[PDB]
């Protein structure tokens, strides 16, 4: 199938027509998606089947085809782009200046912005184009809105 | 069956529009990949 570097859309047929469950970056011939959204399964890219590789719950992220290979991380100072690629609509990169998840093992970048469930694994990006990490999973503060984590797995 | 659909390349758009706003959370990370706020 196609194996081009960049963003993809995660569809189901499984459901009501033709349903977008989440989105993914292919990188060095290896697809990178967040754990829920496929929830291990195969994948099709054509006539070409993708396999899962390497997966993990608690982190909440899945590889296919190879080991994690985005090890990019936020500065912890800089603006990023989230390149969301919602539902039916078109990419669209959006710039923000990332908050603070601050756990027992550590802080991890957060950004403020709230898509359709169908948009997690959508990348994180630096100013330098490089994927910091995948959108699609956080929390829902106080006054309602949500917040998710820049997601990022670690380069074996 | 879950297939994969080509989006777009990943690039930094130049003059994108610029919103949310940066929470600092005090959160909880479970077995199950489930963050949550601590309080
Ligand atoms: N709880 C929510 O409001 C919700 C869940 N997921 C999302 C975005 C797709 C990440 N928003």
């Known amino acids: 199938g196609e194996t081009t570097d960049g963003v993809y859309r995660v569809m189901t047929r499984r459901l009501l027509g033709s349903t977008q469950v989440g989105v993914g970056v292919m990188q060095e011939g290896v697809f990178h998606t967040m754990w829920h959204v496929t929830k291990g399964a195969a994948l099709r890219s054509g006539e070409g089947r993708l396999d899962p590789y390497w997966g993990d719950v608690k982190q909440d992220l899945v590889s296919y085809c190879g080991p994690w290979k985005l090890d990019a991380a936020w500065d912890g100072l800089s603006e990023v782009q989230l390149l969301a690629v919602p539902p039916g609509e078109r990419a669209k990169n959006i710039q923000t200046l990332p908050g603070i998840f601050k756990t027992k093992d550590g802080d991890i970048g957060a950004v403020a912005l709230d898509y359709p469930a169908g948009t997690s694994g959508s990348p994180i990006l630096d100013k330098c184009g490089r994927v910091i990490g995948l959108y699609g999973n956080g929390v829902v503060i106080k006054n309602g809105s949500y917040v998710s984590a820049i997601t990022q797995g670690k380069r074996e | ?39």
Request: glycine share 8%; proline share 3%.
């Open chain 2, 1 to 39: 069956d879950m297939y994969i659909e080509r989006a777009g390349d990943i690039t930094w758009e130049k003059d994108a529009e610029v919103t949310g706003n940066s929470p600092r959370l005090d959160v909880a990370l479970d077995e199950s990949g489930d963050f949550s706020l601590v309080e």
